[PDB]
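Deviation from plan, reported transparently: guanosine-5'-diphosphate complex.
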Amino acid sequence: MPGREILVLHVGQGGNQIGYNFWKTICEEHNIDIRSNQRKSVEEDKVDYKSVFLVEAPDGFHPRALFIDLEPLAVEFLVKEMKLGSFFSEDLMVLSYSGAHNVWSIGYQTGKKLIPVILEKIRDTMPETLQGFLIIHTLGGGTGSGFGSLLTETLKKEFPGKGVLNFSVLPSEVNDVTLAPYNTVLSLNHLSRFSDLVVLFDNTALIRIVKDQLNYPVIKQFSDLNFLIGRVMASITASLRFPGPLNMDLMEMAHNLVALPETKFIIPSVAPLTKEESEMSTELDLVERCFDPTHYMVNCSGQGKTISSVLMFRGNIAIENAFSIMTDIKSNVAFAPGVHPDLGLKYGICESAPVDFDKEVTLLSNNTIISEVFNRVLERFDSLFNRDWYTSDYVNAGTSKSNLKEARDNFDRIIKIYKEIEG
Ligand SMILES: Nc1nc2c(ncn2[C@@H]2O[C@H](COP(=O)(O)OP(=O)(O)O)[C@@H](O)[C@H]2O)c(=O)[nH]1
Ligand code: NA
Ligand code: NA
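Because the crystal trials were delayed, the predicted structure below was used instead.
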């Protein structure tokens, strides 16, 4: 049946590398090997709706996605190493050759030449019942930040009735790109006007989670980092792909989170993170872990104040526990002073657990602690802007020094709005 379709757009090196973990997770959950595009079997094929992310074809299943970048090596070396040629096909690749050089303005301007080709690929493979788009990118670089902001502005303008949701990767506590404060403020300022929901991550928290919650002995490639982002994307969309007592789509979750038009910046968290922990935990254990800063995928100093949260229960869930613990959540977890004791929670329940897991809870939190995370970016921004450092290559690419003051002021307004609701 038509409807519920979603198109994903991967921009830059990070956005495409995260894309491998996401599509590997989607295929595994739908009993599909990503190598031959086939069903693994008919006996293990479950009552589901593969059409959310997958496109059915005679040879097999393909992703409803676009793999976009301003240089060809990050995507190609990914497909060669992981052997994704049959799935990450050439017809889904929008590549160019010049690169963005970690400059948001260059990625924005250069990406404008690929917009006509991107639209035509969308205008063909898109069902008119498509419910929205997901844009996967990093904010500290150039292509994911600049071109990604461009695809956010474009799609929201091109398809006003559809949801445009961003999954954005913040720089680590110490940025591994010196230009990141410029690229992050420009991206966040752009997404605040054209995006419906911005789900944020950073590598410091992702690394902390992998080392402390999964106990990996080493992290050698980003695949041992990006699987957390793919787990969030797959689990928050699980009710759209499998049976459940309580389903929810993209804009349903967005409408429950965005209290004020500017409060669209979300912090995700998942618990548990190993198989053996899903079998001995309770719904109260997982929810408490999700609301604990040790499980936030954004590096935060504390629990903060929750404005509004979306909770997805997957798998072997006791419904009576999920509802009875709501008073414990409202009493133990700090919420914004304006949140009524009976509000701030949006529930989703899916009978399909993540692969090999007994159960799992995914949290999407609209937290005032975003003001603290954003104030760090602004402080890094001002340290460079007040000294006129690295501004020439942004001015030479269309972004005036006045424009950098425009995006920064509007970015500071977002901080103060989150500050004011906090009390
Ligand atoms: N989590 C994650 N972060 C990444 C990945 N690749 C790059 N980054 C981060 O993104 C920033 C660099 O942006 P990048 O995507 O490499 O440049 P771009 O191709 O111009 O978008 C740095 O802060 C990196 O730490 C990835 O695969 N996973
Ligand atoms: Na790059
Ligand atoms: Na790069």
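Residues 12-13, 71, 74, 141, 143 surround sodium ion (ligand 2) (CB under 6 Å). We consider this an acceptable substitute for the interim report.
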